[PDB]
Design a protein around this nucleic acid. Structure first.
Ligand SMILES: Nc1nc2c(ncn2[C@H]2C[C@H](O)[C@@H](COP(=O)(O)NP(=O)(O)OP(=O)(O)O)O2)c(=O)[nH]1
Ligand SMILES: [Mn+2]
Ligand SMILES: [Mn+2]
Ligand code: NA
Ligand code: NA
Length: 327
DNA sequence: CCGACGTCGCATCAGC
DNA sequence: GCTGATGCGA
DNA sequence: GTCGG
C-alpha cells in the first residue's frame, strides 16, 4: 500500500534490525525484525495496537510490546538511547562502507577509528576491498538511472562480443526487471566451452577487455567464476565525470544458463518465495539446478531446463515475466 | 524448552 | 607450504 | 525475535 500507513513502525523495526546485525551481531534477530517490517509494510490498514499487529506472521510478543510503546509515545526508549551511544552508532555507521562488516566495524571503533575521516587517516589498517569502499562511499550509495544502465549495457555487450562472438552476456538484477533505476549492474556470462561436464581464462578475458576500454576501474574480488568490481561511463568533451558504479560479472555453465538467469534476475524476495513453493511441491532450486526431492526429502539429479518457464512449470506456477518478479 | 532461521564465491585469518 | 574457518556481500 | 517440534 502506502509507506506512511505504518511508516513509523516499519522505520523503527528496520532500525532495530540494523543494530542487531551490526552491533549485537545477532543475525537472526536482524532477520526477525525485517520479516516483521515486511509483513507490516504490506498490511493495508493503519495499526492501532500491538495486539492487532501480532496477528501477522512474524510479529510476536516483543514486537507487539514495542509497537504499543511507539503508538503511545511516538518513540522507543531503547532506540533513542542507542542513537545517543557513540560506540554503537559509530559501529553501525561504519558498516555502510562496502567491505566493512559488523566484525571489522567493531574492531575499528575499538581502536578509536569511528568516522570516514578516521578511516582515511588509516589506510594501513584497511584491506583492498575496504579501501575502495571508502574511496567510493558516496558513489556506491547513489542509484543508477535506467538511461545510464542502458549505456553501460551497450558497452558490456559490445566489448564482450569483441573478445569472442560466441560469448553470451545477459544483464540481470533489477535492470532485467525493468526497474527505472538500479543499485548496481549484474552481468551473467556464458560460453560454449564452459558447461557443467567440462579455454582457461574465460572470465578474465572479458574483465581484461572492459579494463582496456577504461570501463572497469577497480577490482573488489576476482576468481574463475565471479568478478566483483567498479565501473564508470565515459564522459564527453569537458562535461563532468559520471559516478563510479558497482558491477558484478558471473560466469555460469552454459547448460545451467536459465537457472542462473532466473536466480540473478530475482528479486531476492521473489526467489525465496519461489524456493518456498518449490519445497511445498517437492523440489529444490539454486542458481545452478532444479532437483526433485525424494520421499525422505533428499535432492535427486538435476532436471532438464531449456527455459525459465520450464522451472515455473515444474513447480506448478504460472509463468511470470521479470517485470513481475518484485516479489 | 529449545533448535531453526538459504546458499554461494572470494578474501583473509587461524593453525598445523 | 598447506587446509580449514570465518568475514563479507549478494 | 518468532515460530513450531
Ligand atoms: N543468494 C542471495 N541472492 C540474493 C540476495 N539478495 C539478492 N540476491 C540475488 C537476487 C538479487 O535480485 C540479485 C542480483 O543482485 P542485486 O543487484 O544485489 N539485487 P537487485 O539487482 O534485484 O537490486 P539492486 O537494483 O539494488 O541492485 O541476486 C541474497 O541475499 N542472497
Ligand atoms: Mn543489482
Ligand atoms: Mn549485484
Ligand atoms: Na504473530
Ligand atoms: Na559494509
Amino acid at each position: 500500500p502506502q509507506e506512511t500507513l505504518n511508516g513509523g513502525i516499519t522505520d523503527m523495526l528496520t532500525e532495530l534490525a540494523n543494530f542487531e546485525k551490526n552491533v549485537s551481531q545477532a543475525i537472526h534477530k536482524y532477520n526477525a525484525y525485517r520479516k516483521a517490517a515486511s509483513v507490516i509494510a504490506k498490511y493495508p490498514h493503519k495499526i492501532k495496537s500491538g495486539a492487532e499487529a501480532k496477528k501477522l506472521p512474524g510479529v510476536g510478543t516483543k514486537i507487539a510490546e514495542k509497537i504499543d510503546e511507539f503508538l503511545a509515545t511516538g518513540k522507543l526508549r531503547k532506540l533513542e538511547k542507542i542513537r545517543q551511544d557513540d560506540t554503537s552508532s559509530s559501529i553501525n555507521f561504519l558498516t555502510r562502507v562496502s567491505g566493512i562488516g559488523p566484525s571489522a566495524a567493531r574492531k575499528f571503533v575499538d581502536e578509536g577509528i569511528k568516522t570516514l575521516e578516521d578511516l582515511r587517516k588509516n589506510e594501513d589498517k584497511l584491506n583492498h576491498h575496504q579501501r575502495i569502499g571508502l574511496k567510493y562511499f558516496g558513489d556506491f550509495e547513489k542509484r543508477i538511472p535506467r538511461e545510464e544502465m542502458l549505456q553501460m549495457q551497450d558497452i558490456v555487450l559490445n566489448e564482450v562480443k569483441k573478445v569472442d562472438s560466441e560469448y553470451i552476456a545477459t544483464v540481470c538484477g533489477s535492470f532485467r526487471r525493468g526497474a527505472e533505476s538500479s543499485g548496481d549492474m549484474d552481468v551473467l556470462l556464458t560460453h560454449p566451452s564452459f558447461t557443467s561436464e567440462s579455454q582457461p581464462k574465460l572470465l578474465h578475458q572479458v574483465v581484461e577487455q572492459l579494463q582496456k576500454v577504461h570501463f572497469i576501474t577497480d577490482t573488489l574480488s576476482k576468481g574463475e567464476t565471479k568478478f566483483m568490481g567498479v565501473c564508470q561511463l565515459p564522459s564527453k568533451n569537458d562535461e563532468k565525470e559520471y559516478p563510479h558504479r558497482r558491477i558484478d560479472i558471473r560466469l555460469i555453465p552454459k547448460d545451467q544458463y536459465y537457472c542462473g538467469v532466473l536466480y540473478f534476475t530475482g528479486s531476492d524476495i521473489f526467489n525465496k518465495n519461489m524456493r518456498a513453493h518449490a519445497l511445498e511441491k517437492g523440489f529444490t532450486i539454486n542458481e545452478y539446478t532444479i532437483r526433485p526431492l525424494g520421499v525422505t526429502g533428499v535432492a535427486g539429479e538435476p532436471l532438464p531446463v531449456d527455459s525459465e518457464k520450464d522451472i515455473f512449470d515444474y513447480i506448478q506456477w504460472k509463468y511470470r515475466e521479470p517485470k513481475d518478479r518484485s516479489e
